[PDB]
Amino acid sequence: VHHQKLVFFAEDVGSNKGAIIGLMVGGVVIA
Amino acid sequence: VHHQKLVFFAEDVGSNKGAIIGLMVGGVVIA
Amino acid sequence: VHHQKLVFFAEDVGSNKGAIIGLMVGGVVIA
Amino acid sequence: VHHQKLVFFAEDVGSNKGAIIGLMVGGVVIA
Amino acid sequence: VHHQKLVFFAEDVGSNKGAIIGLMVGGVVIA
Amino acid sequence: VHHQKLVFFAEDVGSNKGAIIGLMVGGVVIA
């Protein structure tokens, strides 16, 4: 298979106080 | 298969205090 | 198969205090 | 006059992604 | 006058991704 | 006048990714 640009932003992000995950597959994120 | 640009923003994001996930497949996100 | 731009915003997002998921397939998101 | 415990929680708060205000008297909150 | 414990939590707060304000009297909060 | 303990937590705060303000009277907070 092929994955690409799963998340994409074309313009500026101010902040990320949380989670940004291209491809969450297991385990535990807490943001 | 082929995946691409699953999430896309063309303009600026101010903030993300939560979760942004291209392709959640298992495990646990808490944002 | 082919997926693309599953979620798309063409203009600016102010905030995301919740979940934005291109393709949720299993597991647990809590935003 | 006397004010006290205007807002009160006795048990655990999970999250506050919004506004919690004891006493709003003017100005502008955006949560 | 007298103010006290305007906001009160007795048990644990998990997170505050927003605003918690004892006494908003003017100006601008954006959380 | 007299102010006291305007915001109060009795138990542990996990995180503050936003604003916690005893007494907002003017100006601009962005959290």
Numbering used by the authors:
A (entry chain D), B (entry chain B), C (entry chain F), D (entry chain E), E (entry chain A), F (entry chain C): 12 to 42
Copy the relevant paper text.
pmcAmyotrophic lateral sclerosis/parkinsonism-dementia complex (ALS/PDC or lytico-bodig) is a fatal disease found in the Chamorro population of Guam (1–4), some families on the Kii peninsula of Japan, and the Auyu and Jakai people of New Guinea. Abundant filamentous amyloid inclusions that are made of all six brain tau isoforms are characteristic of ALS/PDC. We now show that tau filaments from Guam and Kii ALS/PDC adopt the CTE fold in brain and spinal cord. The greater heterogeneity of amyloid filaments, when compared to CTE and SSPE, probably reflects the fact that ALS/PDC is a multiple proteinopathy based on neuropathology, as suggested for cases from the Kii peninsula.
The frontal cortex from case 2 also contained Type II Aβ42 filaments, like those that were described in brain extracts from cases of AD and other diseases. Type II A β42 filaments were present in one case from Guam. Senile plaques have been described in around 60% of cases of Guam ALS/PDC and assembly of Aβ is believed to be part of the disease process. Alternatively, these changes may be age-related.
